[PDB]
């Protein structure tokens, strides 16, 4: 199995991990901050997804330094993962296009 496929495969795994970990850590970091809503795990996971995909609807978000730091890591991993998938696809199309040209 080529690397772009294997990497794309890994990116997925790590992303899911980042989501779970970021969910856990967001709660740990936000409880204790008056008025924070990112304090229960189920909605904390939803928040992590909507952040990683960059949808960010605005229903939930961190107010503390650490919550925002955790948030950045989720953002980055999310943009990179989906972005790496794009890389793999391009690589996939390139290879086959070369073949289609007899190369």
């Amino acid at each position: 199995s080529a690397l772009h496929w294997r990497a794309a495969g890994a990116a997925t795994v790590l992303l899911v991990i980042v989501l779970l970990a970021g969910s856990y850590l967001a709660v740990l970091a936000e409880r204790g901050a008056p008025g924070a809503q990112l304090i229960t795990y189920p909605r904390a996971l939803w928040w992590s997804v909507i952040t990683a995909t960059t949808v960010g609807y605005g229903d939930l978000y961190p107010v503390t330094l650490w919550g925002r730091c955790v948030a950045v890591v989720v953002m980055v991993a999310g943009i990179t993962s989906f972005g790496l998938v794009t890389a793999a696809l391009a690589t996939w199309f390139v290879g086959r296009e070369q073949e289609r040209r007899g190369h």
Partner: antibody
Amino acid sequence: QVQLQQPGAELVKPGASVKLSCKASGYTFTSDWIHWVKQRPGHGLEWIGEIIPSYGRANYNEKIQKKATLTADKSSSTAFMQLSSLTSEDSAVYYCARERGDGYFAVWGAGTTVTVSS
Amino acid sequence: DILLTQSPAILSVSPGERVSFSCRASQSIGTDIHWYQQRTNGSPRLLIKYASESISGIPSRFSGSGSGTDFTLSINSVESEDIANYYCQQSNRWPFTFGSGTKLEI
């Protein structure tokens, strides 16, 4: 079986401190939070604080005078609440509770009636 | 800090009659509300979670409803054993808070 075991009573002289416990049994998860609730005779329930055993962090009520200090023992599955420099004003029932990190108190301990007298 | 107002503080009802307790949050909180029943000398016990979700062990007689700011805990055909104090509790914003409570008198 009783998920949370709490001592029946604790007599404390004014100015002294006491350390309440809360033995936990049953299913346990890294996302569990143990809350403490004060209730004086004839009155409502007051949120005192909380702590997450898996990590060891605890938060407290900012609307009241901090008298408690929460700790946890992962090996013995026991949560402790240190109350210090108590006065009659601190005489009440202190309940411990378990929240699966989803916002509600699924189970409460029987409660420890603390009396502050000489 | 969300203020949960429970009024009236006491509710007189006749046997087998329907009753409804009220709990109003100072601000909107979706359906992040939990109801507890505490009998004389008894420890608090969860009745309804997230405004209307049932709980195992609890009688089908108990029901919940509402969203936003106004929540209601209902009981169809109240019987002697329902006598006790009732509290709502929010988990929408930190820190979690409790309503002052409503006593049920038969």
